């Protein structure tokens, strides 16, 4: 009855952002200003529809990604945009209808030494399609030579650890991101705000 | 069953380096951050760093940066602190302690040598 | 650097009464992202190491008295022992891990008072 949007940002772990979480929220009601109103998100930034009135809508369907990626990159989290995370690991449509949530992670998630479990993907041979996932390892080969699975001269394994450390820069410091997707179908509308 | 045993006591000139040795048994080695603390005679607690025995990276307090070098030897579980260039407010003893994760800063020192 | 000035130096209770100590931080160490204060309560006896009594501000380490508990937030802590016990006689540290380098507050000393 109530959306279980508490798992999702209140989880103990986020995933990689090359390898990134979603959760479909259904069938359910959306107290959407118990996110809004918090000044504990960093960054709040809705497209397509407006942060007030949003527990006056309903959707079809609501798709919540999760996430972890460096301070400076969340600006990619949006419509738009390229770069690194958007190109290569997470793409938002032109047309996005939802909201990007992010709040400032340094006490989870980074690690005396740098954390070595949030990675992700460096190169890659084309852009990602909106909301298009990619978790394969194979060697990424730069010029005619090929690999064979060893690295090299122009061979580099794909995915890349951010190694968080509590004493980097805000900006190299991890943020975790929370992308509400509001989904209008022509069907029967499942999530809904309280009022 | 956790414990940690230093080793003993030692005396040193000014401008001298001692190394102390901490070693940890009863528990995954590996999984825990390390600190160091000491204790000059009838003062307060002074932090000196942190070691993570899961590859060996560290973190000093600024004011030892240069002087102070943390080290493990997975093999035997031990954790090894060397101080260089001695100074008499170095007097002190030195405690190497375990923490409870291998998270951030930590989040208590729940296990300690006997100095 | 995060300074951490513990109130009183000196504390005098009567057996099996309260006994309350302040920490005070200069900068808060409350993070919203998990709603925790990192802030951490020792126990030091004479020719022995610190004990480890609380971690994140109210939640007691394994193995210690339930007289104990701490309470506060952000920057304002307190360390209570509801009735004091003779074994309770020792110098108290509070210690902020939020910031490097991590500061131990200055030391409250529990005294029997008679």
């Known amino acids: 009855n109530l959306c279980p949007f508490g798992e999702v940002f209140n989880a103990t772990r986020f995933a990689s952002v090359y390898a990134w979480n979603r959760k479909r929220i259904s069938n359910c009601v959306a107290d959407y200003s118990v996110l809004y109103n918090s000044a504990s998100f960093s960054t709040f930034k809705c497209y397509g529809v407006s942060p007030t009135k949003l527990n006056d809508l309903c959707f079809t369907n609501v798709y919540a990604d999760s996430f972890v990626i460096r301070g400076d990159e969340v600006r990619q989290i949006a419509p738009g945009q390229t770069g690194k995370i958007a190109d290569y690991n997470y793409k938002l449509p032109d047309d996005f209808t939802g909201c990007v949530i992010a709040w400032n992670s340094n006490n989870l998630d980074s690690k005396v030494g740098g954390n070595y479990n949030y990675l992700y993907r460096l190169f890659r041979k084309s852009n990602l399609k909106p909301f298009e996932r990619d978790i394969s390892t194979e060697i990424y080969q730069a010029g005619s030579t090929p690999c064979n699975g060893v690295e090299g001269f122009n061979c580099y394994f794909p995915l890349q650890s951010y190694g968080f450390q509590p004493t980097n820069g805000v900006g190299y410091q991890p943020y975790r991101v929370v992308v509400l997707s509001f989904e209008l179908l022509h069907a029967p509308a499942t999530v809904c705000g309280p009022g | 069953l956790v414990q940690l045993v230093q080793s003993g006591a030692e005396v040193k000139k000014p401008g001298a380096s001692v190394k102390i040795s901490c070693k940890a048994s009863?528990?995954?080695?590996?999984?825990?951050?390390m600190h160091w603390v000491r204790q000059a005679p009838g003062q307060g607690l002074e932090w000196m760093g942190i070691?993570?025995?899961?590859?060996?990276?560290?973190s000093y307090a600024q004011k030892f940066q240069g002087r102070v070098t943390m080290t493990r030897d997975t093999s035997t579980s031990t954790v090894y602190m060397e101080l260089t260039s001695l100074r008499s407010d170095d007097t002190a003893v030195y405690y190497c302690?375990?923490?409870?994760?291998?998270?951030?800063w930590g989040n208590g020192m729940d296990v300690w040598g006997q100095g | 650097d995060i300074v951490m000035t513990q109130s009183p130096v000196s504390l005098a209770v009567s057996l099996g009464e309260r006994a309350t100590i302040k920490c005070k931080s200069s900068?808060?160490?409350?993070?919203?992202?998990?709603?925790?204060?990192?802030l951490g309560w020792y126990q030091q006896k004479p020719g022995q190491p610190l004990r480890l009594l609380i971690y994140?501000?109210?939640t007691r380490e394994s193995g210690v008295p339930d007289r104990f508990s701490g309470s506060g937030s952000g920057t304002d802590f307190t360390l209570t022992i509801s009735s004091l016990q003779a074994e309770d006689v020792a110098v108290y540290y509070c210690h902020q891990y939020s910031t490097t380098p991590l500061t131990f507050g200055g030391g409250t000393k529990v005294e029997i008072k008679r």
């Open positions: 302690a375990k923490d409870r994760v291998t998270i951030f």
């Open positions: 994140w501000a109210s």
């Open positions: 070691i993570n025995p899961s590859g060996g990276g560290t």
């Open positions: 900068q808060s160490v409350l993070y919203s992202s998990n709603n925790k204060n990192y």
């Open positions: 009863g528990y995954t080695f590996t999984s825990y951050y």
